[PDB]
Amino acid sequence: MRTHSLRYFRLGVSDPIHGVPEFISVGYVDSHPITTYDSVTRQKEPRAPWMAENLAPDHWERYTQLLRGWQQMFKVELKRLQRHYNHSGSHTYQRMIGCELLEDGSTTGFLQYAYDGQDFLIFNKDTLSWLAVDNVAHTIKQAWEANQHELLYQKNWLEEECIAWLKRFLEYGKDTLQRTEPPLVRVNRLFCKAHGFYPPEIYMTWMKNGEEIVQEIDYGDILPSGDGTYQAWASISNLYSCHVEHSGVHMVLQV
Amino acid sequence: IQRTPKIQVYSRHPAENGKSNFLNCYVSGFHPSDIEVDLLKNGERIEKVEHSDLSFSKDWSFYLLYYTEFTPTEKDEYACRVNHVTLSQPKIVKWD
Ligand SMILES: *[C@@H](C)/C=N/c1c(NC[C@H](O)[C@H](O)[C@H](O)CO)[nH]c(=O)[nH]c1=O
């Protein structure tokens, strides 16, 4: 298998605009949204058909209740942060939890918080400690580190539970997640353009006489095409060639 | 600390005049989440425009994709108009 990952994000907004939710939580398997929750719907809903088809109402019902609680917790935690920062107006609070199952069989686990889109608290599951960016984060770090069992719980969730959910979701979404759609690559006046590929992970470079020189190259972002596939590009007497690497297949376009 | 959106306007498949396609506008790397995106055809806003739900990046920024079904022509000029707290006036990005 290729590298896969499971991530859940939480976004809390203090003082939101008319409409805009105070809380949003979204789950992803790789680049794919799988689940969604907000303070307006107040319901956990699937974001992939293979999630809807494989998890009974019971799952959605249970997690809807947990997310209602997690939403309230996020409100209270943001209130604490904004007060200790002595900030006025609308401010954001975000959380990202997740894990990866690497091609080699090894795993990674991560958990971090951000305030106003900037790193706030970063968990270290090996030392069971929280890395604080400033004194407000340091005050929270001392409070979270005083609950030793929660750090232990979090290590177990990241290392065991998360991986098990990811393997489960990978099987559900196998026809989507484990497929390969090779890129269609073209060169034009110099632009190397690829489209129609899946997974989004691709490497494109230009070689001048079989030597790279990555400084003299402009790389385009891997962009969603809208049909489940991706597109990308890279622009630049000498011989030029475009090199494309995708899912263990190397491609060369000589000019 | 606020981040200005990156705006990318491209077609789903390589464009051919007279052939039905999808015009995409990928808005990313922005913070905070509040954003207004409109797809323009000859300066005028397109009504039938679909979009992805607000999405989350590991760097804490957000992204979305706005798209519409269209048949490109030589005459017709397409653009993406974006507004964010980081922008004084809405930013109009033209399609190549
Ligand atoms: C459906 C399973 C939605 N889950 C969800 C979660 N779930 C992961 C995990 O149990 C949770 O993050 C714990 O806080 C970890 O200690 N998390 C999330 O942020 N959003 C969700 O919708």
Side-chain angles (χ1 to χ4, degrees), chain A residues 1-17 19-102 104-210 217-255, chain B residues 1-15 17-18 20-35 37-43 45-46 49-73 76 78-88 90-93 95-96:
Chain A
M1 235 179 237
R2 305 185 280 250
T3 297
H4 295 289
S5 64
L6 171 63
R7 274 138 35 257
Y8 291 103
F9 284 92
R10 282 176 210 175
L11 165 72
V13 175
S14 69
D15 208 31
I17 248 97
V20 163
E22 196 183 12
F23 181 82
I24 302 164
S25 184
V26 183
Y28 300 90
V29 173
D30 303 335
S31 40
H32 308 265
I34 53 151
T35 70
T36 190
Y37 177 91
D38 68 56
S39 59
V40 174
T41 71
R42 285 181 52 78
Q43 298 293 326
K44 188 201 181 166
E45 292 178 302
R47 268 307 175 254
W50 45 264
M51 285 292 291
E53 289 157 19
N54 294 289
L55 294 148
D58 157 75
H59 171 86
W60 308 94
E61 285 170 2
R62 172 53 171 158
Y63 278 92
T64 284
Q65 298 305 315
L66 298 182
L67 281 147
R68 275 172 196 191
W70 290 336
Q71 168 185 325
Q72 175 56 22
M73 191 187 210
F74 231 61
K75 181 184 182 69
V76 159
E77 284 180 2
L78 179 47
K79 223 173 138 303
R80 208 188 159 186
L81 260 62
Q82 212 176 312
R83 190 228 109 78
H84 289 84
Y85 271 116
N86 181 46
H87 280 165
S88 57
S90 186
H91 291 269
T92 79
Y93 186 48
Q94 295 162 273
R95 184 206 202 236
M96 200 264 271
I97 202 165
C99 58
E100 311 180 301
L101 179 64
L102 282 78
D104 82 326
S106 71
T107 68
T108 68
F110 39 93
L111 172 64
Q112 49 189 50
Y113 286 83
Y115 180 79
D116 286 330
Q118 301 295 112
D119 275 8
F120 180 77
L121 279 164
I122 323 292
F123 185 61
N124 189 312
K125 73 172 172 77
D126 303 313
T127 63
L128 298 158
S129 70
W130 283 96
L131 176 69
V133 300
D134 60 30
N135 284 99
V136 174
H138 183 73
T139 296
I140 310 300
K141 158 200 177 78
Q142 294 182 310
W144 290 359
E145 284 182 6
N147 192 11
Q148 189 74 350
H149 293 159
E150 185 173 327
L151 307 174
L152 296 185
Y153 146 76
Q154 212 70 79
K155 185 175 176 62
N156 183 69
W157 195 86
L158 286 175
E159 291 171 5
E160 297 303 312
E161 286 291 298
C162 190
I163 293 299
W165 280 116
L166 176 53
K167 281 168 176 167
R168 185 177 168 169
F169 297 165
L170 261 170
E171 190 55 27
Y172 295 175
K174 69 183 183 174
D175 295 344
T176 292
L177 305 170
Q178 302 174 220
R179 89 198 197 266
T180 305
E181 282 191 76
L184 304 217
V185 188
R186 76 199 179 270
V187 160
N188 71 275
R189 275 158 155 85
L190 282 179
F191 273 84
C192 189
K193 304 176 125 175
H195 71 90
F197 60 91
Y198 184 85
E201 291 75 34
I202 194 163
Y203 188 49
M204 307 184 75
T205 198
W206 276 103
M207 304 249 179
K208 177 176 81 193
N209 317 293
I217 307 160
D218 180 39
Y219 303 96
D221 306 334
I222 299 153
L223 295 169
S225 289
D227 63 353
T229 75
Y230 294 82
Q231 59 176 90
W233 60 268
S235 73
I236 200 150
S237 166
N238 294 273
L239 287 121
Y240 297 96
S241 65
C242 177
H243 285 241
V244 180
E245 176 82 28
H246 187 257
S247 297
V249 179
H250 194 81
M251 213 185 309
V252 184
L253 285 80
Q254 190 68 44
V255 189
Chain B
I1 184 140
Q2 302 176 330
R3 288 168 261 168
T4 215
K6 190 182 190 175
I7 309 141
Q8 298 174 92
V9 195
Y10 54 103
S11 59
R12 178 181 285 185
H13 313 287
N17 289 331
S20 192
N21 204 321
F22 284 82
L23 182 79
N24 296 308
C25 178
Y26 186 73
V27 180
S28 66
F30 65 92
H31 208 282
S33 67
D34 266 30
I35 193 130
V37 189
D38 303 316
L39 290 177
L40 275 41
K41 172 176 177 190
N42 300 320
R45 193 196 168 262
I46 307 159
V49 170
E50 276 153 358
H51 69 100
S52 63
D53 282 358
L54 179 68
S55 316
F56 306 88
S57 293
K58 306 166 239 254
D59 70 353
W60 312 113
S61 67
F62 316 100
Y63 67 96
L64 301 120
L65 171 73
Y66 275 74
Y67 60 98
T68 190
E69 197 169 32
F70 87 125
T71 300
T73 69
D76 297 321
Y78 293 87
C80 188
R81 186 177 71 196
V82 175
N83 219 346
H84 192 254
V85 67
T86 66
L87 301 165
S88 176
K91 185 179 294 183
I92 306 164
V93 185
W95 176 52
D96 80 88

